[PDB]
Design an enzyme around this catalytic site. Structure first.
Site, PDB file in Angstrom:
ATOM      1  N   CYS A 241       0.819  -1.217   0.000  1.00 41.91           N
ATOM      2  CA  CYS A 241       0.000   0.000   0.000  1.00 41.91           C
ATOM      3  C   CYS A 241       0.848   1.260   0.000  1.00 41.91           C
ATOM      4  CB  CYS A 241      -0.828  -0.061   1.286  1.00 41.91           C
ATOM      5  SG  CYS A 241      -2.057   1.255   1.382  1.00 41.91           S
TER       6      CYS A 241
ATOM      7  N   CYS B   4      -5.917  -9.607  -3.723  1.00 40.89           N
ATOM      8  CA  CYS B   4      -4.786  -9.579  -4.651  1.00 40.89           C
ATOM      9  C   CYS B   4      -3.922 -10.821  -4.523  1.00 40.89           C
ATOM     10  CB  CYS B   4      -3.954  -8.323  -4.387  1.00 40.89           C
ATOM     11  SG  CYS B   4      -4.793  -6.814  -4.945  1.00 40.89           S
TER      12      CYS B   4
HETATM   13  N1  LIG Z   1      -4.493   7.504   6.444  1.00 40.14           N
HETATM   14  C1  LIG Z   1      -5.036   7.633   5.256  1.00 40.14           C
HETATM   15  O1  LIG Z   1      -6.062   8.127   4.855  1.00 40.14           O
HETATM   16  C2  LIG Z   1      -4.200   7.023   4.112  1.00 40.14           C
HETATM   17  C3  LIG Z   1      -4.752   7.112   2.749  1.00 40.14           C
HETATM   18  C4  LIG Z   1      -4.025   6.562   1.644  1.00 40.14           C
HETATM   19  C5  LIG Z   1      -2.751   5.914   1.914  1.00 40.14           C
HETATM   20  N2  LIG Z   1      -2.262   5.827   3.243  1.00 40.14           N
HETATM   21  C6  LIG Z   1      -0.977   5.154   3.451  1.00 40.14           C
HETATM   22  O2  LIG Z   1      -1.525   3.818   3.715  1.00 40.14           O
HETATM   23  C7  LIG Z   1      -0.543   3.056   4.425  1.00 40.14           C
HETATM   24  C8  LIG Z   1      -1.251   2.293   5.542  1.00 40.14           C
HETATM   25  O3  LIG Z   1      -1.668   3.311   6.492  1.00 40.14           O
HETATM   26  P1  LIG Z   1      -2.238   2.848   7.922  1.00 40.14           P
HETATM   27  O4  LIG Z   1      -2.975   4.030   8.424  1.00 40.14           O
HETATM   28  O5  LIG Z   1      -3.000   1.575   7.849  1.00 40.14           O
HETATM   29  O6  LIG Z   1      -0.920   2.752   8.714  1.00 40.14           O
HETATM   30  P2  LIG Z   1      -0.399   3.151  10.156  1.00 40.14           P
HETATM   31  O7  LIG Z   1      -1.636   3.142  10.994  1.00 40.14           O
HETATM   32  O8  LIG Z   1       0.518   4.254   9.975  1.00 40.14           O
HETATM   33  O9  LIG Z   1       0.501   1.894  10.596  1.00 40.14           O
HETATM   34  C9  LIG Z   1       1.885   1.884  10.186  1.00 40.14           C
HETATM   35  C10 LIG Z   1       2.312   0.446  10.465  1.00 40.14           C
HETATM   36  O10 LIG Z   1       3.731   0.374  10.091  1.00 40.14           O
HETATM   37  C11 LIG Z   1       4.478  -0.186  11.160  1.00 40.14           C
HETATM   38  N3  LIG Z   1       5.832   0.332  11.186  1.00 40.14           N
HETATM   39  C12 LIG Z   1       6.277   1.636  11.069  1.00 40.14           C
HETATM   40  N4  LIG Z   1       7.613   1.693  11.216  1.00 40.14           N
HETATM   41  C13 LIG Z   1       8.018   0.407  11.269  1.00 40.14           C
HETATM   42  C14 LIG Z   1       9.316  -0.113  11.473  1.00 40.14           C
HETATM   43  N5  LIG Z   1      10.442   0.601  11.501  1.00 40.14           N
HETATM   44  N6  LIG Z   1       9.399  -1.506  11.621  1.00 40.14           N
HETATM   45  C15 LIG Z   1       8.273  -2.338  11.616  1.00 40.14           C
HETATM   46  N7  LIG Z   1       7.020  -1.843  11.376  1.00 40.14           N
HETATM   47  C16 LIG Z   1       6.906  -0.436  11.323  1.00 40.14           C
HETATM   48  C17 LIG Z   1       3.724   0.393  12.369  1.00 40.14           C
HETATM   49  O11 LIG Z   1       4.121  -0.321  13.538  1.00 40.14           O
HETATM   50  P3  LIG Z   1       3.858   0.160  15.065  1.00 40.14           P
HETATM   51  O12 LIG Z   1       2.488  -0.363  15.413  1.00 40.14           O
HETATM   52  O13 LIG Z   1       4.966  -0.576  15.756  1.00 40.14           O
HETATM   53  O14 LIG Z   1       3.907   1.672  15.071  1.00 40.14           O
HETATM   54  C18 LIG Z   1       2.309   0.065  11.970  1.00 40.14           C
HETATM   55  O15 LIG Z   1       2.076  -1.334  12.034  1.00 40.14           O
HETATM   56  C19 LIG Z   1       0.464   4.140   4.989  1.00 40.14           C
HETATM   57  O16 LIG Z   1       1.695   4.135   4.231  1.00 40.14           O
HETATM   58  C20 LIG Z   1      -0.277   5.456   4.757  1.00 40.14           C
HETATM   59  O17 LIG Z   1       0.591   6.557   4.511  1.00 40.14           O
HETATM   60  C21 LIG Z   1      -2.990   6.388   4.388  1.00 40.14           C
END
Ligand SMILES: NC(=O)c1ccc[n+]([C@@H]2O[C@H](COP(=O)([O-])OP(=O)(O)OC[C@H]3O[C@@H](n4cnc5c(N)ncnc54)[C@H](OP(=O)(O)O)[C@@H]3O)[C@@H](O)[C@H]2O)c1
Ligand SMILES: Cc1cc2nc3[nH]c(=O)[nH]c(=O)c3nc2cc1C
Length: 205
Positions: A109, A188
């Site tokens: 993603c 997918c």
């Molecule tokens: N928010 C929106 O509307 C939106 C829309 C389109 C796209 N996106 C993109 O969609 C993707 C998924 O977003 P989400 O909101 O589901 O994600 P999120 O809530 O930011 O979760 C990030 C995940 O990545 C893990 N992580 C970060 N650093 C890491 C590291 N060094 N080692 C191991 N794991 C690590 C985090 O672990 P911890 O639990 O340990 O922190 C968490 O499991 C992101 O890239 C976001 O930018 C977001």
């Protein structure tokens, strides 16, 4: 042969948690890499294997990718919007581990900003988007079967399985529920129809 074993990266995040729960309920044997296991829930479906460590540590990634049939990437920076290479360096490690272990399918993603006009990114999100672009490049140049999932705003609406998937970032809405996004990442795994493409899941709830 169908995918049975998967690794999920970012399983403790918003979308990760529901993708993990759905994957386990669907019958996959799931391995997760987490920095902090207290962020995984006790109730509901549970991963088969938990690796504690960091996506920035090659050896931790390697341990997670070993033996899998496919990889789901739901890395992100949570509410941190500062300049960053965590996602792209993580993807570099994932690609190297996949190649080392013969794993050839990754669904990852990034964001619909990589499909929309690239001058319409809100300023506060430019740094993260720059790293999404680096991550996308890493994955598309890897020579692996890569489905790029580029969602719009991720919401909290219920799971429907009824969203629309386009290839160009135009669609019925600019929202996808986190649950539907997770459902799509699992979809997918059972088709090649999106390999080598960018996909835009969205729905009117
Ligand atoms: N928010 C929106 O509307 C939106 C829309 C389109 C796209 N996106 C993109 O969609 C993707 C998924 O977003 P989400 O909101 O589901 O994600 P999120 O809530 O930011 O979760 C990030 C995940 O990545 C893990 N992580 C970060 N650093 C890491 C590291 N060094 N080692 C191991 N794991 C690590 C985090 O672990 P911890 O639990 O340990 O922190 C968490 O499991 C992101 O890239 C976001 O930018 C977001
Ligand atoms: C519509 C949309 C909203 C977003 N919000 C976001 N919000 C956030 O905190 N981090 C992000 O990476 C992010 N990406 C987005 C991407 C798109 C395409």
């Amino acid at each position: 042969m169908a995918v049975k074993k998967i690794a999920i990266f970012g399983a403790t995040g918003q979308t990760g948690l529901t993708t993990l729960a759905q994957a386990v309920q669907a019958g996959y044997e799931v391995t997760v890499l987490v920095r902090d296991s207290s962020r995984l829930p006790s109730e509901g479906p549970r991963p088969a294997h938990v690796v504690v460590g960091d996506v920035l540590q090659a050896a931790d990634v390697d341990k997670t990718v070993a033996g899998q049939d496919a990889v789901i990437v739901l890395l992100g920076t949570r509410n941190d919007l500062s300049p960053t290479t965590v996602m792209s360096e993580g993807a570099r490690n994932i690609v190297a581990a996949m190649k080392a272990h013969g794993v050839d399918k990754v669904v990852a993603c990034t964001s619909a900003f990589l499909l929309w006009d690239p001058t319409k990114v809100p300023p506060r999100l430019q740094a993260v988007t720059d790293d999404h672009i680096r991550m996308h490049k890493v994955l598309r140049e890897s020579g692996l079967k890569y489905v790029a999932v580029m969602p719009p705003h991720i919401g909290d609406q219920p799971l429907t399985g009824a969203y629309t998937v386009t290839l160009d970032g135009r669609g019925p809405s600019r929202v996808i529920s986190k649950h539907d996004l997770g459902h799509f990442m699992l979809r997918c795994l059972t088709t090649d129809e999106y390999d080598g493409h960018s996909t835009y899941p969205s729905h009117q709830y």
